[PDB]
C-alpha cells in the first residue's frame, strides 16, 4: 500500500484579482480510492473537477483535481487528501512559491 | 519521432461499495485522447482531446463495443484472481493493464508493450520479442499457460505491428500542431532566505510540452545532483507541464550557482542564474 | 485504437 | 445516493441468510429501509438500522424490492435520496422446474446456446441464475403450450463470464418475489480457443471383455487436468495431467463407446480446450 504525494499550485503564475486555475495533483498512491478536496479558508470548494484515473510505470495512481479561481491577498487555499494508508487526513497549503 | 501510444485499464472490485468498475484511458505521448468508464449511465468511449473529436461514428461505436467486452473480461478476471490467490470475496482488488507501441521518426514500430498487474504488483508481461510471456508468480503462471495454449501472443503481436502503429500515425497527423510541436519551458529563478546564513534557490520551468525535461543545479560547473531537491513533474491542466529544482546555498555564494534546463522546445539548453 | 485481443486470466 | 447491496446473494433460499448493506458517505451505518409499494413508508415502523441488516433465517416475508436511505443530519431533509433497488428473491416455495440446454451444455467459444426452463406447473415467470454471480437473474414470462409453461433463455456469444453452473426457477402470479425450489443444476462449459489435445487407446481401441484398456489424453500445451467424455452420456471423468519426458502433458484413464478428451487448468473448471478428434472404442 502506497500513500499519496500531494502538490498544490496554480495553472498560471498567480496575480491577485486575475482569473486562474487552482490545482491539487495527487500521485504515487495505491489502491485507487482517494478523497481530495480543495479548501478555501478551511472550507470545501464545491465545483471541483478531476482528470480520468490513470497510473505510472510503477503502477501507482495519479489524479489532478482542479477548479477555476481568482486569487486574493486574504484567501488561503489548500488541498485535503484522505486515503487508506493515512490515519488522518493530510493537508497541504497553497504557497505561491511552491 | 519518437512517439508512443498507450492504453491504461484499471479494473476494480469493491464489494458493498459499488459494482465492479472498469476505466480505460488512451494516450499519445503525454496527451490523453480517449476515456471509457463503466460507471457512466450509458458507457461509451469518449474523446478527451479536440483532434479526435472529428473522428466518425464508426470509430466511437467500434471502440465502445470493444471497451464493453474488455470490461466483462476483466470483471471475470477479478473473480478468477480470487481463486488463484485463495482470497475472500469480501476484499477489494485491482487489476491494471498498460499496453501499446513506440514508433520512430519514420512512423515505424520500435517497440511493443503489454503488461498487467494485480493489487499493484507485476502479474504478467509480454516480452520484447512479442511472442513470449514473463509471469511474476505461480498464479500468473496459470494465466501464462492459458495464453500459450490459446496463441494470445500471436494476436497481440499482430495488433502491435499493425493497428497500433497505423492508428498512432493517424493521430499524430490529426493532432500535428499540438502533438508534434514542442513547447519550450518559460523559466525563472527565485530566491528565498532560510536563516541569516542560508538561502534556497529554486529554478522554475512552466508551460512546457512534452513532459520530458532536465533541470540541474551546478556550483562552478559540478552537478549538485546529490544536493538538489527535485519535485515530480506535474500537469498544469492545459496539456502543459511544470517542474522545479531547488538547492540550498550559503548566503553570498548565489553567483557560483547555475540552473541548466534541457527540453526539445529549446533551441539551445538554458543556463540561468539568480540576480 | 484500443486492442481487440481478449486477455482472459 | 447510497449503494445498497445483498450479501452473499439476493437470490436466497428460505432458511438461509442474506444481509443488506447500505453504503453512504463512506460508512455502512445509520440507515432506513423501504419496499417498492410503500416508498415513503420505512419498514419495521421506521427502524433505523445501526449496521447491516442480517435476515436469518430467511422467510418468505423477507422477499421483496428494497431501497435504503442514509442519515444526513446537516441537510434539508434528515436523509439521503433513495438508493439503487435490490430485489431479494426467496427460493424453495414451489416444486422445482426443469432446465435443459440446446443443443447441449458444452458450448463453443463465441457461439450461442439456449437454456430452456419448463414445468407442468403454470409459472407466470421463469428466472435463470448462474451460481455465485451477483448478476440479477434473467427473467422471462412463461409461455403456455400443451400443458406446460416454459421459457427460452439465449446465452452468448459464449465466453468465460457466461460459463458456470446454472439453475432455473419459476414464480407464480401474485408472489413474484417468491421463487420455486431450484431446478437440477446444469454446468455450462465453454470450449476453446485452447488447442485441442490428442486422444489414444493403449494397447488400442479394440477390446474384448475382459482385458484392460487405458485411454490417454495428451498435449504439448500445459493443461493441468484432462476430461474424458463418452457420447454415451456418463458424467465426464477427470484426472490430473502428468508431464512426460518428451515434455508432453498426459493423463491415463484406465477403463464401449465414442470418446473425446478436453484439457483444462487449475482453478478454472468451466473453460475447456477445443475437443480432441473423436475416438471409437
Ligand atoms: C423486479 C422489479 O420489480 N424491480 C423494480 C423496478 O422495476 C422499479 O423501478 C423499482 C422502483 O424502486 O423497484 C424495483
Ligand atoms: C417457444 C419455444 O419453445 N421455442 C423454442 C423451440 O422452438 C425449440 O424446439 C427449443 C429448442 O431449440 O427451444 C425453444
Ligand atoms: C508425441 C510423443 O512423443 N508422445 C509420447 C506418448 O506417445 C507417450 O505415451 C508418452 C509417455 O511414454 O511420451 C510421449
Numbering used by the authors:
A (entry chain B): 2 to 99
B (entry chain A): 1 to 275
C (entry chain C): 1 to 9
D (entry chain G): 7 to 261, 267 to 292
From the manuscript:
Notably, the dimorphic residue at position 80 incorporates either isoleucine (Bw4 80I) or threonine (Bw4 80T). A major division in HLA-Bw4 allotypes is based on the amino acid present at the dimorphic position 80 (isoleucine or threonine), and we have shown that the I80T mutation in the HLA-B*57:01-LF9 complex results in decreased binding to KIR3DL1*001 (12). The structures of the I80T mutant and the native complexes were very similar with a root mean square deviation over all Cα positions of 0.3 Å. In the native ternary complex, the isoleucine at position 80 formed a network of van der Waals contacts via the Cδ1 methyl group of the side chain. This network involved contacts to the carboxyl terminus of the peptide, the side chains of E76 and N77 (HLA), and L166 (KIR). However, the network of contacts to the Cδ1 group of I80 was partially restored in the T80 structure by an ordered water molecule. This water molecule formed bridging H-bonds between the Oγ-hydroxyl group of T80 and the carboxyl terminus and S8 of the peptide as well as to N77 (HLA). Furthermore, the water molecule forms van der Waals contacts with L166 (KIR), coincident with a 0.5 Å shift in the side chain of L166. As expected, *001 (and *015) showed decreased binding to HLA-B*57:01 I80T tetramers, whereas *005 showed no ability to discriminate between Bw4 80I and 80T.
